[model samples]
Target: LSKELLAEYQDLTFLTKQEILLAHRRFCELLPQEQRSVESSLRAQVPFEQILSLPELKANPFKERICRVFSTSPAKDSLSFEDFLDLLSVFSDTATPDIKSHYAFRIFDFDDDGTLNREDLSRLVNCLTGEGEDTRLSASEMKQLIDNILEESDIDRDGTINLSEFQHVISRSPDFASSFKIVL
Candidate 1:
């Protein structure tokens, strides 16, 4: 990439120039050789399944949600280079605390409704704990957990966690930024 292009990305994203190039290299590796041409590369998209196979995301419980939140495709099942960069930028170590929490909120917003309601919270918890019947939370346990979450995070008594409320909750967790990243 040209210096101008590299500098532009550096200005728009949290990633350093070297990191940006590294990210591009990795993204290119995911594309088929035929699609690696300059013209096609600009608009190339890697399938969600292939992205999920990355070691960094493979074992993540919220991997699907992460992809879905970042994907700009109509089907929300593929990521273009820009989309991939945006995903990495938010998850980068240099990302701002608010930025980190902002994307976290989106990732947890399963319904994409701008707020996380009981059903959304329930699904989020299921993803975190596990979906298998054996590993899933008991009904009572789930109810209690959701109640505690709402009590602590559902400010304004709206029975839902909005962006501001989510950020507030994230602010209290000192380790959130550290844990919200994915190393390349």
Candidate 2:
């Protein structure tokens, strides 16, 4: 991988927006032509309004590709609260709290409205691991997981989860934030 790609992967730990975009671009470049459509579907620059109208950007193909990408872990194929907790448990063992918060915020802030929402969680779980022949998470299971995540991250009991709460959770966990250089 290029240094840029490595940085993107590391940045995913903190859910940095630009870095995530960089990662997506890098992944797009790495994919074969058949899989390139999947990357394009999730590309940051792609307008949401254009997705459905484009014959090349259907959700079923994207979902299938995403499932294939995550099929290495069968247990992760499910999108229940238990599955999310299990994923987090494994993450906690190998990743610092900062990294955990990064992924959480990335998935939670789907619309970039700076808050966690049902749509964001749906996209997150769907992109990471969703139903198909390869890997799948039921819609109901995804809903349950989102509810659990919302409850845990909403520090002030507000309907939304703010960046401050996200920062606090990661910062309190350990010192992983200082491990990398901020290129920007």
Candidate 3:
């Protein structure tokens, strides 16, 4: 990728971590009383705060490597794709089903309608562009960007981005992983 595109992708990854963590917390709070036990158990296994504070929470080798990669100046070096995948593998191995499910829903539920729709793409684009203040997007622009991203990253082409697809897109870059960690 070109430097500009890589930077943009890194920014998107950073923003995603922030959004996903917030969404994850919200989802947990919204869980039904009976289902909260399941949520709690899942959370016990992988606390959101600990996950979010990973750079500071633990001294694991992977975390240290990631932090070093992300902290590099001028973004000169980048992680190989396999190394990036390994990072996600570590995250996935550590995360619970509740975390994975929450991530899937947050990424796919673009409309916040408790369902996935094309409109969610518009929200995502707007959020990445720091356009939340506007809170609206032109229909044509929204559709165009959504179509492009979905075509590029939505492997299943289910008209909705899922967790695996999201991970696939993100796990391709160490910078993306670093951005994800910082935002979280």
Candidate 4:
């Protein structure tokens, strides 16, 4: 049974068979006894509070959004076993560039509306610069930056960055793959 699951995970994710087994064991340890069994683990859910505490993500500025994007919970604040796997898969070093960028776009799409518009762009920018008032951008500076970003990446002049537009920006960045990795 583990063998079958192992092969399936390998086929569906960037993780190798050994990594899937190791991840499965780790995921089980995070569960309570009632949901730890493989059959039930598939349906087990862990709240985002616990997930954000992991050292790998503890200080990430967009941690909440990452959890939301990976979460399948109707409340949008929890992760099931497969959801956790999807998180690990995309953050793993071996994930393909397109897939990694795709997930990055999803995480940045604060409203989950399929495009990164002004509100999404501003919110994303705020996350980059900490929320502290002293460090936050002034309204005019923020406007300038957002306009420049759209000018450069909103290829169709639609005032929003679509998936392909975002990918185009990513393709020019040589270090995105390495910089996007998470080691757990």
Candidate 5:
């Protein structure tokens, strides 16, 4: 019943066959009028400047690392259409829990330490209520949230969040799937 409800609510059904093109056009929209190109994947790189324009990732300190996690190119400097599509695949409303969970882990996992270290976790908690400074979590609230994260996510008492551990937590949510955008 939940899945049925979600299927009805997701906004992507109208563009199913045109997803790639839709993604491509959106990517192109980031380019300057003089730099638009659809013929060449080699020239289709979406640089960091444009990526910085992403609405979903705005004001998040961890946005750069988040970008690399989806990057298939070696430079790890920009996003290609394929990489763009890859992110779309993961963020698509119909994506599996594993896929959604994996990216969520990446967004939170700074330095690839297999865990959300002090700074990594704080960055999240600080931005929890809002990107604006006024809404950043207070010391006590942040501490409480961290404690909760450790208590619930650190299944083995390792005091850190790892992949399998992240998977152990973060339940299925229609919201995460619906709003996975990383760019404006």
Candidate 6:
């Protein structure tokens, strides 16, 4: 059952139940024309393609949450509104480094492949940085930056970085990475 946003949001502490609840209402208002109810999983926008896809360099950024942003749904390709609130919680100014790292990996694991392969890395960098003259990665400054991230993280010789590979946190190990990026 969906918890009441009015008071339940207080658990996050970083967010004020009032403003966050207001935003939740707005996000819910735009739900995909379905019969939205208090029990509904509020579906809404804040699409990744627009935000991540940088038109500045003439690139498209592609990209969510619930619990961990409801990163995906077997039911469909759509993202839920509650998912955004959940991710916003982690990304907020007051979130802890450990919390941020945990969620960042989820956002970065674009393909849900449980690994950050070359292709996935390409997507992340492309979204984070505008493209070169090519409209995609090539022998350019952006390309170099993407390459640099991989050179450092792709351990296990898998040609990609797994969660354990990216985060070797003393208290929070990388398996946490593998799990969040789970292909549910």
Worst-scoring 10-residue span by lDDT in model 2: 175-184
| Model 6, CA-based lDDT | 0.45
Off by over 4 Å in 6: 1-12, 28-72, 87-94, 131-155, 164-184
Clash list (residue pairs), candidate 2: 14-102, 130-136, 131-136, 131-137
**Local error of candidate 1 at 120, Å?**
1.4
TM-score of each: 0.64, 0.29, 0.28, 0.65, 0.55, 0.46
Model 6 lDDT at residue 59: 29
Clashing pairs in 5: 54-183, 54-184, 55-183, 55-184
What is the clash count of model 6? 10
For model 3, how does the per-residue alpha-carbon lDDT over 36-148 read when each residue is reduced to its tens digit? 54434443233233334444325442343342233222331333222233244324434333333343344335343543456665554444434435534445765564466
lDDT of 2 by residue, 1-184 (tens): 1133445554334333554455445445554566565434432233234334433325334322322222234432322222222332333235444443444443335343566555554554444453343655436865554345556656565654455444443344343244211100
lDDT of each: 0.60, 0.40, 0.41, 0.60, 0.55, 0.45
Please say which candidate is ahead in lDDT: 1 or 6: 1
lDDT of 5 by residue, 4-104 (tens): 44454354442344777776687666666665676564456777777778765556554576568777777676777666666555554455454444555
lDDT comparison, 2 vs 4, better candidate: 4
What lDDT would candidate 2 get against the real structure?
A: 0.40
Task: Give the number of the best model, judged by TM-score.
Answer: 4
Worst 10 residues of 6 by lDDT: 56-65
Question: Model 4 over residues 46-136: C-alpha lDDT tens digits?
Answer: 7777787665557665677767787767778776767776776665556544454456656777577777776776654554444555764
Decreasing lDDT order of the candidates: 4, 1, 5, 6, 3, 2
> Which segments of model 5 are wrong by more than 4 Å?
1-17, 25-39, 52-66, 88-96, 133-136, 140-157, 163-184
Quote the positional error of residue 133 for candidate 5 in Å.
Answer: 5.1
* TM-score, prediction 1: 0.64
Q: Candidate 3, after superposition: displacement of residue 78 in Å?
A: 42
